Swiss-Prot record:
Boundaries of every SAM-dependent MTase TRM10-type domain copy: 78-253
Catalytic activity: adenosine(9) in tRNA + S-adenosyl-L-methionine = N(1)-methyladenosine(9) in tRNA + S-adenosyl-L-homocysteine + H(+)
One BP term from GO: tRNA methylation
GO CC aspect terms: cytoplasm
Subcellular location: Cytoplasm
Native species: Sulfolobus acidocaldarius (strain ATCC 33909 / DSM 639 / JCM 8929 / NBRC 15157 / NCIMB 11770)
EC number: 2.1.1.218
Protein task: Catalyzes the S-adenosyl-L-methionine-dependent formation of N(1)-methyladenine at position 9 (m1A9) in tRNA.
Chief localisation class: cytoplasm
Protein name: tRNA (adenine(9)-N1)-methyltransferase
Length: 253
């Protein structure tokens, strides 16, 4: 599941490394992606250790060389367990919002599925961004890593949301997804539309209306996942991997 050249978390991590003059890192067995390395440093107690090493050039990610094993490249910093953290400016955008305002209107099968799907969204977000870009709204009691849990949607001047809905009137294109920075996935209800109830309460109260977008494959909902965690990964494959919407949908089968 290969990396993008321009991942948000990678951008901010490399900003910081250039600031420190570090243009090369020995990564050992780690995945050659600054986004994955960021995740390990933030969550799993990894950091940098000063040491000279030589290795082969695996990849170069926003101008930072990632090397391992043996070869002619030099590094002065080595990524490993228990090394020093560096501070990165964690990205606000994009924001993924799961809207569980509908939870109590759901039957028992729908609840069980939903909770699993939402749980799995933590692993999805850790693949492309990190926990803090995921928000769950409408169940104040939910816990999910370092994801933001809020009873109600608190919404800023700069949020530019689109709601994912199979019964939306706008067809999704890579263009429309590129132009939004906030995505709201509710739960399927009455085996029909995808209901974002907490977001709806806020919108109805303030006279906002957010575009509602259906994802199609070749002019149709045939082939397109209805799992929350897979919708999420589609969005992120388009936004962070510059993958086309069509190929993003194929990837999730």
């Amino acid at each position: 599941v290969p990396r993008g050249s321009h991942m948000t978390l990678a951008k901010v991590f490399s900003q910081k490394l250039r600031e420190l003059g570090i243009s090369s890192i020995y990564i050992g067995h780690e995945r050659p992606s600054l986004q994955s390395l960021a995740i390990k440093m933030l969550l799993k107690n990894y950091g940098l250790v000063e040491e000279r090493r030589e290795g082969m050039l695996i990849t170069q990610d926003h101008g930072i060389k990632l090397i391992s094993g043996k070869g002619t490249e030099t590094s002065r910093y080595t990524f490993r367990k228990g090394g020093k953290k560096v501070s990165i400016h964690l990205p606000e955008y994009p924001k993924m919002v799961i809207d569980l305002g509908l939870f109590e209107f759901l039957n028992e099968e729908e609840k069980e599925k939903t909770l699993l799907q939402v749980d799995l969204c933590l692993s999805v977000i850790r693949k492309f961004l990190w926990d803090g870009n995921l928000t769950v709204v409408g169940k104040a009691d939910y816990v999910l890593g370092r994801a933001n849990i809020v009873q109600s949607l608190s919404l800023s001047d700069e949020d530019n949301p689109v709601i994912l809905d199979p019964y939306g009137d706008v067809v999704a294109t890579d263009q429309i997804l590129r132009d939004h920075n906030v995505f709201v996935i509710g739960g399927i209800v009455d085996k029909g539309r995808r209901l974002d109830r907490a977001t709806e309460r806020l919108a109805l109260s303030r006279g906002y209306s957010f575009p509602r977008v259906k994802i199609q494959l070749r002019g149709s909902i045939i082939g397109v996942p209805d799992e929350i965690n897979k919708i999420l990964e589609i969005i992120l494959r388009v936004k962070e991997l510059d993958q086309s919407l069509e190929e993003a949908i194929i990837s999730l089968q």
